[PDB]
């Protein structure tokens, strides 16, 4: 139908916007701490601690399959990256500290993203 096409164009345009959001958030991780999945070869107990691992590569795969229906779903995955790290790693670690800085800096980006998603519909 024509409606299904229009809906698909909306999803494509959201995917465009979320790709720009993802690029901007990933720039706030210059150390690349959150770039890839925590390695289960290198952290073999990880899934005993963290039930829903997340990382920027995994989000990018979901994004490119147009698998984010709305900004809430995308924010859920970004919050998992931060929240997973802040539980597994102690406060005095470069990992925890990187997550705090990513959360703080990403907030600004996500605030305007929400306005754009609402504004453009």
């Amino acid at each position: 139908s024509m409606e299904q096409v229009a809906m698909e164009l909306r999803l494509t345009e959201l995917t465009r916007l979320l790709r720009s959001v993802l690029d901007q958030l990933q720039d706030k991780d210059p150390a690349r701490i959150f770039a890839q999945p925590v390695s289960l070869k290198e952290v073999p107990d990880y899934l005993d601690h963290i039930k829903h691992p997340m990382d920027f590569a995994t989000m990018r795969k979901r994004l490119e399959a147009q698998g984010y229906k709305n900004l809430h779903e995308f924010e859920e995955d970004f919050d998992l990256i931060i929240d997973n790290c802040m539980k597994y790693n102690a406060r005095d670690t470069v990992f925890y500290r990187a997550a705090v800085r990513l959360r703080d800096q990403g907030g600004v980006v996500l605030r305007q993203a929400r306005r754009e998603v609402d504004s453009i519909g």
Side-chain angles (χ1 to χ4, degrees), residues 62-68 70-76:
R62 181 163 168 195
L63 178 64
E64 289 315 330
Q66 300 186 347
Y68 293 115
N70 54 54
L71 181 52
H72 180 77
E73 290 188 345
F74 177 95
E75 293 174 322
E76 285 194 329

Side-chain angles (χ1 to χ4, degrees), residues 8 11-15 17-19 66:
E8 291 160 4
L11 177 62
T12 298
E13 284 306 297
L14 176 65
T15 302
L17 180 156
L18 296 182
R19 194 182 298 112
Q66 300 186 347

Side-chain angles (χ1 to χ4, degrees), residues 29 33-34 38 46 49-50 52-55 77-102:
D29 173 31
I33 290 161
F34 305 105
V38 172
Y46 191 65
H49 290 267
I50 294 306
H52 296 98
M54 191 50 51
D55 62 276
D77 272 354
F78 177 66
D79 286 336
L80 280 174
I81 291 178
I82 300 316
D83 292 341
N84 290 345
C85 183
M86 296 173 69
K87 292 165 184 83
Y88 190 80
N89 304 102
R91 231 165 5 259
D92 73 332
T93 65
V94 64
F95 307 106
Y96 184 115
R97 290 165 172 282
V100 165
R101 289 164 63 83
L102 176 60

Side-chain angles (χ1 to χ4, degrees), residues 1 20 23-24 27 29-30 32 35-36 42-45 50-51 54-55 64 76 78 89 92 94 100 107 117:
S1 72
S20 169
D23 290 344
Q24 286 177 68
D27 291 334
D29 173 31
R32 302 193 69 86
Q36 293 292 330
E42 305 170 356
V43 188
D45 74 359
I50 294 306
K51 299 294 173 188
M54 191 50 51
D55 62 276
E64 289 315 330
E76 285 194 329
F78 177 66
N89 304 102
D92 73 332
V94 64
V100 165
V117 166

